[PDB]
Automatic annotation (TrEMBL):
This is Acyltransferase. CoA binds at V202, L209, W242, S256, N257, I258, F286, S303, E305. Transmembrane segments: none annotated. One of its GO terms (molecular function) is glycosyltransferase activity. The keyword Transferase applies. N-acetyl-D-glucosamine binds at S187, H197.
Length: 328
């Protein structure tokens, strides 16, 4: 006989995986296949799901087309079901490290690039069963999962081709420890000391982030987590953003959109050592999906837009400031 059964080393060699991944693989091997067997939806079923997850039509096409088969793509399928398992074993547990497995090298199929979209879609039924136990409204569960689409989109924007390399982040959605309430996202978290809180994150990135929308989400966070996760019992929300950078105040008066947002926040860090530019790349991403062109090519169509580039011209840099906001 010539057949080889799929194991850590076979899988690691089949897909062009680096030496380092070995440990991870062994660990997945010691973890079973999932007790509920993994299955990808297919055809219309899949296209509907992907559409419900706001994945752009082009990528949805490619995704369904490269969808792995248990018999045809035996390495991929071994890694799929074990990666799925490594995620659901930690359902509800926000303490567990956000480990969604490595990216596959891109010279395997399109299938390799979309591997973690497969993980995601394979995990949807389970997390939604969890949503249901926790009494969470469907509308909210779905809204939360939607971000897959944005992430797929982002990947295409940032490189020539489809994909989704933010699998560490999607463990949050998939573990049922992250929820989108209105315009904003909240995640269960405890500090290094045991103190329970929420992480506040901004999905869509770039788009219409309005004070009233922002206010609305903040007013939902607490009753929501009290209702569905009593215990934990957070009362504040932590977060870092260029938005919290006081330097903005040098250009923008107190009624500017961003400054109103910043007001919600109690800063806790201090200005960083001179010439830090930790804010540069995300402020630029948010304000004009960038890309890389010369600064004076960029549009100047708002106070904010004019302020972002005036500051970089005067050779200064944007910072990434941190703080909390006491939840209503």
């Amino acid at each position: 006989g010539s057949h080889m059964m799929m194991d850590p080393e076979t899988v690691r060699i089949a897909l062009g995986l680096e030496e380092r991944t070995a440990a991870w693989l062994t660990e997945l091997d010691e973890l079973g296949p999932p007790a509920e067997p993994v299955r990808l939806p297919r055809g219309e079923e899949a296209r509907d799901l992907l559409r419900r997850l706001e994945v752009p039509e082009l990528d949805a096409e490619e995704i369904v087309a490269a969808a792995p088969d248990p018999d045809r793509d035996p390495a991929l399928w071994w890694l799929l079901e074990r990666t799925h398992h490594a995620i659901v074993r930690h359902m509800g547990d926000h303490r567990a490290k956000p480990r969604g497995g490595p990216p596959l090298p891109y010279e395997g199929g399109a299938a390799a690039r979309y591997f973690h979209v497969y993980v995601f879609l394979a995990t949807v039924p389970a997390v939604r069963r969890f949503h249901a136990e926790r009494g969470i409204p469907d509308e909210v569960g779905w809204e939360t999962l939607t971000q897959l689409g944005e992430l797929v989109a982002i990947h295409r924007r940032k490189y020539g081709q489809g994909g989704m390399n933010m699998q560490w982040w999607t463990t949050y959605h998939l573990r049922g420890i992250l929820y989108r309430l209105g315009r904003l996202q909240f995640s269960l978290a405890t500090g290094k000391d045991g103190t329970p809180h929420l992480g506040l994150h901004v999905p869509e990135w770039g788009g219409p982030l309005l004070p009233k929308a922002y206010d609305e989400s903040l007013h939902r966070a607490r009753p929501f987590f009290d209702r569905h996760f009593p215990e934990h019992g957070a009362r504040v929300a932590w977060g870092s953003s260029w938005m919290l950078d006081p330097q903005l105040e040098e250009y923008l008066t107190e009624d500017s959109n961003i400054i109103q947002l910043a007001r919600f926040w109690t800063l806790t860090d201090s200005a960083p050592e001179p010439g830090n530019a930790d804010g540069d790349s995300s402020i630029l991403e948010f304000v004009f999906r960038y890309n890389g062109q010369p600064l004076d090519e960029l549009p100047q169509r708002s106070s904010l837009e004019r302020a972002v580039i005036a500051h970089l011209k005067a050779g200064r840099h944007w910072h990434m400031r941190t703080g909390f906001v006491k939840l209503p």
